[PDB]
Amino acid sequence: MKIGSGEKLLFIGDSITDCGRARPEGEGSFGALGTGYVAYVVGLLQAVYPELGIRVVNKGISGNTVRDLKARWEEDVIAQKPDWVSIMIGINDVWRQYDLPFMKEKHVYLDEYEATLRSLVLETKPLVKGIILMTPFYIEGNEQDPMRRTMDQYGRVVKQIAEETNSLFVDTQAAFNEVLKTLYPAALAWDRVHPSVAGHMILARAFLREIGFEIVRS
Amino acid sequence: MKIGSGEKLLFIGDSITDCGRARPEGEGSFGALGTGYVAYVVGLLQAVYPELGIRVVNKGISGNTVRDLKARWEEDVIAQKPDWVSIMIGINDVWRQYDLPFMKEKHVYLDEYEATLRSLVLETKPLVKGIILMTPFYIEGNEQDPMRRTMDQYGRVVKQIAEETNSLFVDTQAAFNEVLKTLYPAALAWDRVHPSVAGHMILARAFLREIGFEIVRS
Amino acid sequence: MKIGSGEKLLFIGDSITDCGRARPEGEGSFGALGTGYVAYVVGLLQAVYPELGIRVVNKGISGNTVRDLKARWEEDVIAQKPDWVSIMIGINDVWRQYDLPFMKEKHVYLDEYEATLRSLVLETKPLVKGIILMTPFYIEGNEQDPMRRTMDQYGRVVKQIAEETNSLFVDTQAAFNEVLKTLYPAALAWDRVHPSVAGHMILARAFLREIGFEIVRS
Amino acid sequence: MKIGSGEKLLFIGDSITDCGRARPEGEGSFGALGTGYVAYVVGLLQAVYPELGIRVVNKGISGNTVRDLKARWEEDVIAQKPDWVSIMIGINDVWRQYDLPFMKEKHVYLDEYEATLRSLVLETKPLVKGIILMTPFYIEGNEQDPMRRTMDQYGRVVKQIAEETNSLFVDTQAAFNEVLKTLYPAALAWDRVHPSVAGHMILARAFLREIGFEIVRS
Amino acid sequence: MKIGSGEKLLFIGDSITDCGRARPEGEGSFGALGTGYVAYVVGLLQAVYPELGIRVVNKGISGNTVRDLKARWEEDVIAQKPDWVSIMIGINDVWRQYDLPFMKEKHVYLDEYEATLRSLVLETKPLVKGIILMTPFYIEGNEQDPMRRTMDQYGRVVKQIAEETNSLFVDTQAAFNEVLKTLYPAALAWDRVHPSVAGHMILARAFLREIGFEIVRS
Amino acid sequence: MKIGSGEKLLFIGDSITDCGRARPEGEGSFGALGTGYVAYVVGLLQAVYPELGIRVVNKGISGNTVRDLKARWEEDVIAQKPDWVSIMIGINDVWRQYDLPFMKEKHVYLDEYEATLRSLVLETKPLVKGIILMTPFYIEGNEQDPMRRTMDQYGRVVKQIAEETNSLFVDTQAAFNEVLKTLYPAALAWDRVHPSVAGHMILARAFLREIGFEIVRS
Amino acid sequence: MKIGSGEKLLFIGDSITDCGRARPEGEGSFGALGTGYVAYVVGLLQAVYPELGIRVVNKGISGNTVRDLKARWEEDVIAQKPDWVSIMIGINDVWRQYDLPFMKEKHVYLDEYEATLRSLVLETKPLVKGIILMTPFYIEGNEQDPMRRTMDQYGRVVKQIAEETNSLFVDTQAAFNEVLKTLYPAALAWDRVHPSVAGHMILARAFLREIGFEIVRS
Amino acid sequence: MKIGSGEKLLFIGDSITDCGRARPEGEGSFGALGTGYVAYVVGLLQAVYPELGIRVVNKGISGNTVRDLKARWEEDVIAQKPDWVSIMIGINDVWRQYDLPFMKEKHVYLDEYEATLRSLVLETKPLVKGIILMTPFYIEGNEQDPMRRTMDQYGRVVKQIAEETNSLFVDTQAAFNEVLKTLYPAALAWDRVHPSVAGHMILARAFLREIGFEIVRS
Ligand SMILES: [Cl-]
Ligand SMILES: [Cl-]
Ligand SMILES: [Cl-]
Ligand SMILES: [Cl-]
Ligand SMILES: [Cl-]
Ligand SMILES: [Cl-]
Ligand SMILES: [Cl-]
Ligand SMILES: [Cl-]
């Protein structure tokens, strides 16, 4: 287990992280953690490792890009004095390119995404025990679908930043890809982004694996 | 796995089971499955065994005792033609005795409990592939608390019904008792019955273990 | 115009048709017609051909397959004594196969689809002035995406039913496919089914073209 | 087509423009454009000219007179840096004269309307590619009805300003008048101002014609 | 006064009458009487003639034509055993012809109007103390506006039915016409039908005059 | 008629005046005037004297005493530049003495009521054409009921102030007393303060009489 | 105590009794008992005599007269098999006479009141352990107020029915009259019927006294 | 009676005190006092001692610890100029230790509780006539249940502070303990903190006893 008792683990990202979490505090109660992978991660850890006295805070915000992360970083990350910070961002940075193709101001293109994401990592790195970088994902098994293709380029950036900064790394796309061998995307998410419970469980599983709790087939 | 692809797994019980499931159908989306252990079970199995193509229905109803199960059994169980039926009932049968001590008609005493549960199991067993009997529970580590002691007695009934009928069996009390070595009950459930996400995870993990998916530390 | 003054045009289908139409009557105001392509058709015809005194009824119901159409056909179509009946059904018949792959009873497979649609058209044809068969559609430009491929197969059914019965015919897929040369699907519909105003305009424009009002560039 | 790809087209006016648009931004989504002629214009352009990558913003506000326009001009027009600005105002300036005849402070009489409207045009003109002036209208075919009479005087002012300032011009009254040869006003608008879908389609058609997309009978 | 103490006065009609009255009973409080001319009549009579102990029931229903009155007459009039019945119907009978010109089944043409109203009056007359026939109205001072002209024709029917049956008679059109010498219709009713408090006062004052309480200037 | 065309008449007081009026403006619409005597007064004047082009504003506020009036006087009276001001206050000043007998800070005793009311009158008097002072009232026919007794002392103060300052005067208590010869108070107001429509009509009648519109029996 | 452990005490009456009790059952929680004197009685007995294991049901319904009690007596009293029945009815029987003086069919005059109450008591007496008749009341200290005088007459009926049938008897008027030596009615109930918590306490204290729990000063 | 007429008694604490009271004032109405023991205390005093003209204010706030009390003390206690202050705090200070065991910042441990509580007492003591210190409580009869054990240590501190500062003292735990000889905790409070009406009555009784109104068995 990478995380120890008494440590504070903070999650940040977009709607996939948010999942209705309590604003602004994002702690004090699972209600407060929202109803997706963050809550699942906390619940699974309490069920299986109840002696691991970790404090968890959810600072996800629906709609956010990496630009939006940067704008709130000081208040929502640095000021919370976390020990561990998990980041999952990029879905919107990409999505907007595809759903609002002519609203170019809402697009965060790859060079800016990369640099800004790296900046957040390295502002945080000296202040914390560790960082977990989770890739964005798109629930689409065709690697040539334009938005899945773009997404994978963003995810490859995340992986490079993780390696460069010695952060922990979760490839959320690979976790989905395995299930997409079996299920059509709609079975997980109508819009290929916001998943069912099962999709949140895919996320929670992938996260937990990287912090040293690996849920496998019997 | 005990359960196979193409098989229909139907959960029945009280609020622990219900968790806001869609009425009457209790199927067709996880929204429809509610927000507790049933959904968690379905989601964990989809995340980890997506090729296990089980169809799941949630027939939980808040407040029910086994007397209420009997009254709706034909419509809500038999007529659904399930392959596997999971029963978790007894919390209310017990609780009423302690929260409304003088309203004896709302109590389901051990004789009624045993005879009705037994009868439901024997009636159902020839019509289905299998039955999973889950014990009621009370989130209270003191075995001499009166309601805990009672609940343990109802759980003994369940265990013996399952042994006799060769049903699968989940000891939910023992699942909570392990966590209660660490946590005071209010950390899981203010009222000792309705738990947080973590409590629902305890339940899902105990269910899954008995059907052959065992989640363990490491 | 194919349709004349004083004639009753009745639209039937799923949510694409429904769009929040007034239940049960589906007539007596545009509020009553809902907020999608049916209303747009009625409004464009009133704006451009106000002397075409058509009466329009919207009998769309969200979620329906052709199996549901059959169950309500006497009350919602025959008993309304329409002059023209417009049918757009198949999206759900298909989608269920992909979003709920294991709930086979919610699937309407090609044999059921063809036989039921065919039967409805032949039963209705002698009772009315004319029938307009609109294909289902899937807003996805990759012909090899599994659900798109399926949907194209259901559309082939529609096209052949219409040829055989001398019904009018709208190829809604081809209408979307032209736009999909330019736009990624999420620009029209996050879930590839339920579109923006622009998607409803695509639909209304294809409908109108087939009844003899062709909107073209310049 | 007067408008080019990558250009920003901004609509301003009263409730007829507003139609429930998102405040304050009025962009990002059709929901955000509201449910009337502005949304229709955007939808028709996307359906028929999807390669015309125009960005559209709706700054309509229910209740507004030309006075109200002037009070918000800098924030809601100039600061948005539009390429094209469409204006439709005057309905309320007139209406109040008739519905609140003794509340004279709410009345905007013709000399002030003219001068203030011209001022807005010529403050904007050097900053934009072009301007589209849409007349007010009143859905009343009797040219001697007092409020229709007044309205026409306002519309004649708009036309003079358009000619004087070399703005594009839409005579919304003429567009209604054509349909009023056939329909009584109540068929379009109970209150002779806020129309049905069809009335919004009349507006959208008239607008589109002037920017070079002319929808005609087949 | 035409009406005496201890007598039951029942009002029936459309929305003008209804004004949000309590359903089904329409009695037992003014809340129950709604917020328009019925309530105003009752309140003025209580304020000025408190010893006139009349009991008043409001059976207005929004949207009704005389065809709807007939369908409910036994339950909502006869079975209430009133002493006096006040009828104001025809606005919708007319309006539909103009707002939904092509939905001819919603129209109640003069032949149906006259025969049904006449029949209701003659059936009712032997069972009650008296009948008060109030004309429909249209708040429009131009006698040549088509809907006004129609409405005047329906009012002629009412007037002649009342003469023949020796019913009391209120000319609501003439009551509005006097005010329309001063005010444009929108000052009383944007849609020319549903008026402000002032319009309801016009109505109450005309009703009261015919039952022998005349409110006059000075 | 004391009031002339083009003049502004402003009403101020407590809930009896307020009656749900629009805050803060209290004008622009009858909705905005609320649903009691103020609206009735405006409606009766429009119905009978539509050429009297008066502008009316309702600044009543539920719960107010004369202290509360004084605290808002400058904004809600003086700044509105009325021509005529009507005041009805004192019900709460008295009521509190009786319903909250030990919360003495909420009580406004007679010497303070008198002086403060006079102060408001004489601050306004030089600024306006005239003032109408309406007595408080209590809908109770027993002159020895403690709260009716107190009320009458307040009303006698109002009358003295009116005489001293040459203001117009409405004795609302006398208007109620006449009807209380016939009806028990509950028939008008359960709580002997907030009346039915009829009670509001009693008020409106009494007000109108004093400004020169006297509604009498035929 | 007059009532014993294991006995079912059922309260029936109007809104004073109802106080928002759960419909239809009126039992199973205090929420279910409503928020007035019934709940207070149950709570005081539980606080002070917790070993008195009484089961309490609230069958109050707002608005009821004794005529309404009769209509529901079989279902809401007899079929509940109570041991003790507490009746408090007459407020509405009286009040209607004064608040709706002309709606004589809503009045329950003394002859109907006495005969119906008497009949209910005699029918019920052989089926139960005991009956407690509580007088209606009117919170008004002037014995010559008309409605108070009436109410006192109905209370005399109750007192004499109870004497004759050897029922227990609570004089609620006398309980209020003692407090009314100090407090004006509006301090307890603006409408003289529906009281504050203090009024419900007066009621509970009078009930309790008659069943042998007397709360006294010191 | 320790408290005299004309004195102001102020209650402060957590949810048990709060019970939905009006914010911020917490006075003016029982609605405003909330629906628990504070309201009961006021009601019982008004019912039995209506001449005791005490003014009562409820400043309870749900969730509060002694830290939270200290943060609002000046505004919510000192500024209100009470004559008597009742304090009941500590439930949350303890609870958090048990329900959120790893969120240590939310815990108020005993040495801080003691000192801070004493500080509030002695800041208030010179300013008031007297102080009533009510112990926290936990509705659990097992003195060795960890949270009941902790609670009792807090209550013993309260008692020591009361003795040291010559404050009045209510042992709320002892009052519950007596009833817990008979009832299981769930019969009073599912969560062992927020009780039924009966539990609030236990509290009100215990409070009243200490101020000299002792409610005993007959
Ligand atoms: Cl998002
Ligand atoms: Cl339950
Ligand atoms: Cl659908
Ligand atoms: Cl507007
Ligand atoms: Cl109507
Ligand atoms: Cl008030
Ligand atoms: Cl009642
Ligand atoms: Cl709390």
Give the residue from F92, F145, F147 with the most G CB atoms within 10 Å of its CB, the best one to mutate. F145
- The pair of three-digit structure tokens given for residue E148, joined into one six-digit string: 């006004």
Nearest CA in chain H to G51: H182
Three-class SS state of H9: strand
Total count of residues recorded for chain E: 218
Compute the distance from residue E41 Cα to the ligand 7 centre, in Å: 28
Which residues of D15-157 form beta strands (DSSP E)?
55-58, 84-88, 130-134
Return the closest-CA partner of residue C30 out of C14, C13, C45: C45
Query: Distance from CA of residue F175 to its chain's centroid?
Result: 13
Cα separation, B123 vs B69, in Å, equals: 13
Cα separation, D32 vs B169, in Å, equals: 54
Active site residues of C: 15, 191, 194
Cα torsion for H148, H153, H159, H160, to the nearest 10°?
A: 180
What order of strands is seen across the sheet that includes strand B55-58?
B55-58, B8-13, B84-88, B130-134, B168-170
**Interchain CB contact of F101 with G (< 8 Å):** yes
Place of tokens 């004084």: F70
Cα separation, E194 vs E139, in Å, equals: 9
Whether the CA torsion B40, B43, B48, B51 is positive or negative: it is: positive
Tell me the residues of chain A between 144 and 173 that have a Cβ less than 8 Å away from chain C: 145-147
Residue H198 to residue G47, Cβ atoms within 8 A: yes
**Interchain CB contact of G99 with F (< 8 Å):** yes
Tell me the residues of chain E between 36 and 75 that have a Cβ less than 8 Å away from chain G: 53-55
User: Contact at 8 Å (CB) between B138 and B92?
Assistant: no
Chain breaks in chain D (C to N over 2.5 A) after: none
Residue H55 to residue F103, Cβ atoms within 8 A: yes
Cα separation, G147 vs C204, in Å, equals: 69
Cα separation, D21 vs D38, in Å, equals: 9
User: Contact at 8 Å (CB) between F59 and F26?
Assistant: yes
Q: Which ligand is nearest to the CA of F193?
A: 6
Residue B27 to residue C101, Cβ atoms within 8 A: no
Cα separation, G43 vs H160, in Å, equals: 31
Residue numbers in G near F193 (CB within 8 A)? 190
Is A171 labeled as catalytic in the residue annotation?
A: no
C29 CA: distance to closest CA in chain D (Å): 8
Q: Is F106 left (phi over 0), alpha (psi -120 to 50) or beta?
A: alpha
- The pair of three-digit structure tokens given for residue B177, joined into one six-digit string: 């008792």
- The pair of three-digit structure tokens given for residue F90, joined into one six-digit string: 């004192």
Give Cβ neighbours of residue D128 (< 8 Å, ≥ 6 apart): D82, D83, D84, D85
User: Contact at 8 Å (CB) between A183 and B47?
Assistant: no
Per-residue exposure over D23-55, b if at least 16 CB sit within 10 Å of its own CB, e if not:
eeebbbebebbbbbbbbbbbbbbbbbbbebbbb
Q: Are strands C84-88 and C8-13 parallel, antiparallel or unpaired?
A: parallel
Cα separation, C184 vs C197, in Å, equals: 16
Q: Name the residue among C98, C186, C187 with its Cβ closest to that of A186.
A: C98
The residues spanned by each domain of chain C are: 1-218
**Alpha-carbon separation of residue D216 from B14, C44, D161, D179 (angstroms):** 64, 11, 28, 14
Return the closest-CA partner of residue D90 out of D42, D159, D41, D10: D159
A37 CA: distance to closest CA in chain H (Å): 21
User: Contact at 8 Å (CB) between A168 and A162?
Assistant: yes
Nearest CA in chain B to H141: B145
**Interchain CB contact of D4 with A (< 8 Å):** no
CB atoms within 10 A of CB B210: 17
**Alpha-carbon separation of residue B126 from B55, B83, F169 (angstroms):** 20, 11, 91
Task: Give the end-to-end CA distance of chain D in Å, rounded to a whole number.
Answer: 21
- The pair of three-digit structure tokens given for residue D183, joined into one six-digit string: 């329909």
Q: Name the residue among A27, A28, A53 with its Cβ closest to that of H101.
A: A53
- The pair of three-digit structure tokens given for residue H78, joined into one six-digit string: 């000192």
- Phi and psi, residue G68, nearest 5°: -70, -40
Give Cβ neighbours of residue F126 (< 8 Å, ≥ 6 apart): none
DSSP string of E60-128, one letter each residue = --TT--HHHHHHHHHHHTGGG--SEEEEE--HHHHHHHHHSTT-GGG---HHHHHHHHHHHHHHHGGGS
Own/partner long-range contacts of B37-40 (Cβ < 8 Å, ≥24 apart): B37/B200, B37/B201, B37/B203, B37/B204, B37/B207, B38/B11, B39/A197, B40/A40, B40/A197, B40/A201, B40/B200, B40/B201, B40/B203, B40/B204
Instruction: Determine which one of D62, D83, D145, D194 is catalytic.
Output: D194
Angle, CA of F95, H204 and H106, to the nearest 5°: 105
Residue G102 to residue E5, Cβ atoms within 8 A: yes
Place of tokens 């964990």: B44
CB atoms within 10 A of CB H179: 22
**Interchain CB contact of G191 with E (< 8 Å):** no
- The pair of three-digit structure tokens given for residue B18, joined into one six-digit string: 């219900």
AA letter at A81: K
- The pair of three-digit structure tokens given for residue H84, joined into one six-digit string: 């008597």
Kindly state the helix (H) or strand (E) to which residue A87 belongs, with its residue range.
strand A84-88
Instruction: Determine which one of G15, G86, G167, G171 is catalytic.
Output: G15
Candidates 3.20.20.370, 3.90.420.10, 3.10.310.10, 3.40.50.1110; CATH matching E1-218: 3.40.50.1110
C104 CA: distance to closest CA in chain B (Å): 9
C9 CA: distance to closest CA in chain A (Å): 32
Residue C100 to residue B5, Cβ atoms within 8 A: no
User: Contact at 8 Å (CB) between E60 and E16?
Assistant: yes
- Cis geometry, peptide bond prior to residue F136 (ω within 30 degrees of 0): no
Compute the distance from residue C61 Cα to the ligand 3 centre, in Å: 7
Return the closest-CA partner of residue H208 out of H15, H49, H89: H49
Return the closest-CA partner of residue E95 out of E54, E60, E62: E62
- The pair of three-digit structure tokens given for residue F175, joined into one six-digit string: 């208007």
User: Contact at 8 Å (CB) between B168 and H130?
Assistant: no
